[PDB]
Amino acid sequence: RHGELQYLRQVEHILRCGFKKEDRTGTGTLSVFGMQARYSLRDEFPLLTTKRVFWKGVLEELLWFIKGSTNAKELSSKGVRIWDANGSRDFLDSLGFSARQEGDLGPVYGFQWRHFGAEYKDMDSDYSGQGVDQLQKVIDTIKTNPDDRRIIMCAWNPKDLPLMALPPCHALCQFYVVNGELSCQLYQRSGDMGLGVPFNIASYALLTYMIAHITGLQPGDFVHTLGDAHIYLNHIEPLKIQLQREPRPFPKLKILRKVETIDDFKVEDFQIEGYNPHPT
Amino acid sequence: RHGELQYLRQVEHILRCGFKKEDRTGTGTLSVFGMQARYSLRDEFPLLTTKRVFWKGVLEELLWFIKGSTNAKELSSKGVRIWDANGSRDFLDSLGFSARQEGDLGPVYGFQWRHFGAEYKDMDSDYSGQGVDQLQKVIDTIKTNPDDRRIIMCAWNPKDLPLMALPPCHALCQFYVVNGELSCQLYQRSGDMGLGVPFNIASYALLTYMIAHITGLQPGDFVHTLGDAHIYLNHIEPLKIQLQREPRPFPKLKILRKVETIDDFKVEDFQIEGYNPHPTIKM
């Protein structure tokens, strides 16, 4: 009944039934293609508790997407370094982006979310009014037509892929309204169960909370859908131990004032209450 | 157990646990958000048996996507009329597409799959060399880096939605290879369980057979993921009938000759064998 048991059963499923498969560096995983979990957002927030999730990084990363930034340095300056390797001088050069300033990830999530289809130049360019503001369209559609079956934000942009330091793993999400509740489903093409998945779940549940707040709805569910769901071979033992841990009740997420537009959210507007994860 | 039980069980879930939810024309549905099923493609083909599916329409429609057509007349001439309404004069004007000639669906699947990011003009334009050929990119990637986790074809194109007669319900699909077997997952944003979904399952099952044929792999799984999975209220009794039908074993799909490119498949290349469905039900 605790929502985290779905994630733990997913990990066990992969350990038991996954097939060996290599990633881009020729390093091994056990993998299963196609999974789905449902995390309730109703009076709790699914920030996993069997291993600590880096919540500060979740929140700052999302605010960074929302501002449309593609500069890794702009997130790093918040003390969140998770995108710094992908914007490093040597990683960019290895992709043939030698003309790029360091930190310049190319047209990744924030850019596609706010400017889909605009012509990417660099991370300093001013993209005001260019391309499709998918995030605002999502919000305005939820307000005016909550039954709509087309409420989609898609970061996957086949035309821009060669410019990206990484194609998005979070390929698209869809929102859904019924009974005054806003739900969201993510299609995640590639999921590292041990490192990334718990952070991605918290990311999209946060987005859902933020959008429900500004559209006057209550959070419903977050539906997590994976493509390549995998575990690195040198995470199997730490995971088998985490798999013995009983999850603690999920924390609550509180938004500390009335906020009117998605662009107006700041770190201080949020507070996670009663988060008690198991130790390292 | 029989792969079709998954579909029946999704229908049952929706009838029991779905919420009433109105659609575009305010006609009612029972709806659940988020569902997933896995249909084995290993020496069987998931063409539903509890009611007969329009196999001919599956095949022609898919062939029509592959050639990149956006012209509902070009599919109608095969006697498959499922797009004709969406390309009717009346439908097109209702959407404010006055300038557009009849049959011209705008930049829908065919065009996105073969020319994504191209400037659309009309259904008669020559788009050769324009945009991203995602379909060929998928096939070439499968051939050269089967471990790749980015093997995606996306019909959802935010830029082109305003020109489309209908944004795609089949938003994106991903391919996956392990152990010499090709799998496919479809993200389907909206699924009419009674009328649309059995047809949708066979369509993407068939695309996966075809890519597998071209790339020298064997069919693995089709993983069907749904957004708004719904049943129209006037399909509730016909579906209650269907639910009391036992599924008969799934047929096999045969490809009758060596085909080399995805563009070279034709209707005569395919044969469905052992397809013994319960009668039709109208909906």
Swiss-Prot record, chain A:
Keywords from the UniProt entry: Cytoplasm, Isopeptide bond, Membrane, Methyltransferase, Mitochondrion, Mitochondrion inner membrane, Nucleotide biosynthesis, Nucleus, Phosphoprotein, Transferase, Ubl conjugation
Active site: C169 (nucleophile)
Cross-linked residues, Glycyl lysine isopeptide (Lys-Gly) (interchain with G-Cter in SUMO2): K266
Modified positions (Phosphoserine) in chain numbering: S88
Enzyme Commission number(s): 2.1.1.45
Superkingdom of the organism of origin: Eukaryota
Residues noted as binding dUMP in the record, renumbered to the chain: R24, R149, R150, C169, H170, R189, S190, G191, D192, N200, H230, I231, Y232
Pathway: Pyrimidine metabolism; dTTP biosynthesis
GO molecular function: mRNA regulatory element binding translation repressor activity; sequence-specific mRNA binding; thymidylate synthase activity
GO cellular component: cytoplasm; mitochondrial inner membrane; mitochondrial matrix; mitochondrion; nucleus
Major localization class: nucleus
Listed InterPro entries: Thymidate_synth/dCMP_Mease, Thymidate_synth/dCMP_Mease_dom, Thymidate_synth/dCMP_Mease_sf, Thymidylate_synthase, Thymidylate_synthase_AS
Assembly: Homodimer.
Function: Catalyzes the reductive methylation of 2'-deoxyuridine 5'-monophosphate (dUMP) to thymidine 5'-monophosphate (dTMP), using the cosubstrate, 5,10- methylenetetrahydrofolate (CH2H4folate) as a 1-carbon donor and reductant and contributes to the de novo mitochondrial thymidylate biosynthesis pathway.
Family assignment from sequence similarity: Belongs to the thymidylate synthase family.
Identification of the protein by name: Thymidylate synthase
From Swiss-Prot, chain B:
GO terms (BP aspect): dTMP biosynthetic process; dTTP biosynthetic process; methylation; tetrahydrofolate interconversion
Covalent crosslink: Glycyl lysine isopeptide (Lys-Gly) (interchain with G-Cter in SUMO2): K266, K282
Record organism: Mus musculus (Mouse)
Listed name of the protein: Thymidylate synthase
Catalytic activity: dUMP + (6R)-5,10-methylene-5,6,7,8-tetrahydrofolate = 7,8-dihydrofolate + dTMP
Alphabetized PROSITE patterns for the sequence: THYMIDYLATE_SYNTHASE (PS00091)
Disulfide bonds: none
Lineage of origin: Eukaryota, Metazoa, Chordata, Craniata, Vertebrata
Keyword set includes NADP: no
Positions that bind (6R)-5,10-methylene-5,6,7,8-tetrahydrofolate: D192
Keyword Thylakoid: no
GO CC, alphabetical: cytoplasm; mitochondrial inner membrane; mitochondrial matrix; mitochondrion; nucleus
UniProt-listed Enzyme Commission number(s): 2.1.1.45
